[PDB]
């Protein structure tokens, strides 16, 4: 298999070698595909409220 990661902002499908990881005081890790992703999720913007997100597409289907 080719093991696929999921983006903790938009839940986009990530492959090996791309992206980054954050670790908060909690010990909660996050895995971002895009710098743009990281910036948003650390700005504490809600994924639901941003249109290109899968979150948003969930809310409104």
């Amino acid at each position: 298999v080719v093991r696929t990661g999921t983006c903790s902002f938009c839940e986009y499908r990530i492959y090996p070698g791309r992206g980054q990881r954050f670790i908060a005081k909690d010990g909660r890790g996050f895995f971002f595909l895009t710098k743009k992703a990281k910036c948003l999720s650390l700005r504490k913007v809600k994924a639901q409220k941003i249109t290109w997100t899968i979150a948003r597409r969930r809310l409104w289907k």
Binding site: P16, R21, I23
Partner: protein, 138 residues
């Protein structure tokens, strides 16, 4: 009586994020809040290259804020978390949101019991006592 003697192997490559003077959180209950970074072990530099430590390193530091018994002396500490992104064998880069360390004796023993927050993988392999005291290890 000094040095890092209780290290269990080779420490992996981490981008050095904590040069000298760097002040980091102290995650142990030793009662010191922070660590002021004085030197880092095993370094011969180039002209005017600041000595740097990263996750897993053993530094030489002092305590700026904490129990009056601790500050004003020179102690050794072991870096746990760093905010400078480094990279792991999977190609992903990681970072924590703080710079954290734990005061330790040169033998690799911690002075303390609980370690606040997670400890980085790269610290465990090297320092089994630290690893023992970890709540979580990433």
């Amino acid at each position: 009586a000094r040095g890092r003697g209780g290290q269990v192997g080779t420490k992996a490559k981490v981008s050095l994020g904590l040069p000298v003077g760097a002040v980091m959180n102290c995650a142990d209950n030793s009662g010191a809040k922070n660590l002021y970074t004085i030197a880092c072990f095993g370094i011969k530099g180039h002209l005017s290259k600041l000595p740097s430590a990263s996750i897993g390193d053993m530094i030489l530091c002092s305590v700026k804020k904490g129990s009056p018994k601790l500050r004003k002396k020179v102690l050794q500490a072991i870096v746990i978390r760093q905010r400078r992104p480094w990279r792991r064998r999977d190609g992903v880069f990681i970072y924590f949101e703080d710079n954290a360390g734990v005061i330790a004796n040169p033998k690799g023993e911690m002075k303390g019991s609980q370690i606040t927050g997670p400890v980085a993988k790269e610290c465990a392999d090297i320092w089994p006592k630290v690893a023992s005291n970890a709540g979580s290890v990433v």
